[PDB]
């Protein structure tokens, strides 16, 4: 994908996160578990919902054939009528098909972007209090219990509060144990 | 019905149909396509 997240550096998705499109999996002393990100999933639903509505709305006026009859010596205008009417069915079919194809790509790329951005949200909260492992996961340099996890999930992680514990752990790791 | 075609009635909320272009009533918009489907979700794993 254009944003390299879905079926990219995050290889494959989670059958087990059922309550949203994007979210988190965590793992600590008290266990592990999945949790949807409500806010991103909601922005996405808003986007896609609006998109589907805009498509319906723009296709609202659009050519509507009407039947006209012509006698056997009005063949030139019967042909001009057929071609005019076929001409519009063709313009409109192209418009619908191409809009659908073009917007499908954008939609699929929109979600990809949404996962990248969420990953980056967590990345820039944690900074060097966690280590980027490369598969979509962060490994903390400090103990992070369920309360601390939620703080990551909801925008509230206090970096200063853990950084001391973080610097001690990074220290132990560089030194070799 | 609310929408009629020389080949039969249409009973649909959809924005498009491909039945026949000469309709009367409150109809969707005719296209020659066999298939039109929008993505809403995301790319589904392997």
């Amino acid at each position: 994908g254009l944003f390299g997240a879905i079926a990219g550096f995050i290889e494959g998705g989670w059958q087990g996160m059922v309550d949203g499109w994007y979210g988190y999996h965590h793992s600590n002393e008290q266990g592990s578990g999945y949790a949807a990100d409500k806010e991103s999933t909601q922005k996405a639903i808003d986007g896609v919902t609006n998109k589907v509505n805009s498509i319906i709305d723009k296709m609202n006026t659009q050519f509507e054939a009407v039947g006209r009859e012509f006698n056997n010596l009005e063949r030139r205008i019967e042909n001009l009528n057929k071609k005019m009417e076929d001409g519009f069915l063709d313009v409109w079919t192209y418009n619908a098909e191409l809009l659908v194809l073009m917007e499908n790509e954008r939609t699929l790329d929109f979600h990809d972007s949404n996962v990248k951005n969420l990953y980056d949200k967590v990345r820039l909260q944690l900074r060097d209090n966690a280590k980027e492992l490369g598969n979509g996961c962060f490994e903390f340099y400090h103990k992070c219990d369920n309360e601390c996890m939620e703080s990551v999930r909801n925008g509230t992680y206090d970096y200063p509060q853990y950084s001391e514990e973080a610097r001690l752990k990074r220290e132990e790791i560089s030194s070799g144990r | 019905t609310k929408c009629q075609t020389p080949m039969g009635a249409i009973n649909s909320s959809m924005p498009f149909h491909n039945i026949h272009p000469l309709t009367i009533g409150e109809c969707p918009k005719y296209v020659k396509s066999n298939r039109l489907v929008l993505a809403t979700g995301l790319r589904n794993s392997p």
Partner: antibody
Amino acid sequence: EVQLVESGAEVKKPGSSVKVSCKASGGPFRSYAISWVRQAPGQGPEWMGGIIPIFGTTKYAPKFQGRVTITADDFAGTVYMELSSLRSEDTAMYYCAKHMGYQVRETMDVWGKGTTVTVSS
Amino acid sequence: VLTQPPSVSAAPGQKVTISCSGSSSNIGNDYVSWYQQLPGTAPKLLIYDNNKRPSGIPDRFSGSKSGTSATLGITGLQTGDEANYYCATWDRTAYVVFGGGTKLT
């Protein structure tokens, strides 16, 4: 700004089915879930279940899991509720109510006026 | 199975309080919203997420979760406030549970 308008009163015999609808203004596709909540004469409200947009998934209450079906016609801006195996204690006012977002949740910020179903023999 | 006192009473101008109570698997973890019902009308959202208050609702209404139970408070109360009040919450199998209600006079 969103108006929820429901279908007319219904009168049913026990052991049959009713199917109420609810039309939401705007859209027609929505980014918020819709639920069905009922209220029996002299009783508090009971939540029946609701449906999530795009995902289409439904969530029902223990009390009804098994005889309620919630469905949507997103192009018409309409959700439906069908309750079968009716009994006289299903005689109640049936409200559709929308949530603030995509999840069905304790918070429903706009309600329909209500529609009555009477279950008598 | 969510506990609420059947009725509460007071005179035009005082501050009443309706409590609401249940186990860890509803109020302890999950949030509470409160609703107002006047005869002939659908319930009406008064407060949500424990203590937020939607537009249209005057700041004489409020609430909180003082433990595994939550309360609503009205102040400067008018004749219009004569109604039924219900707390709602989310209970983990999973459903929206309401309280029994409380007639306010």
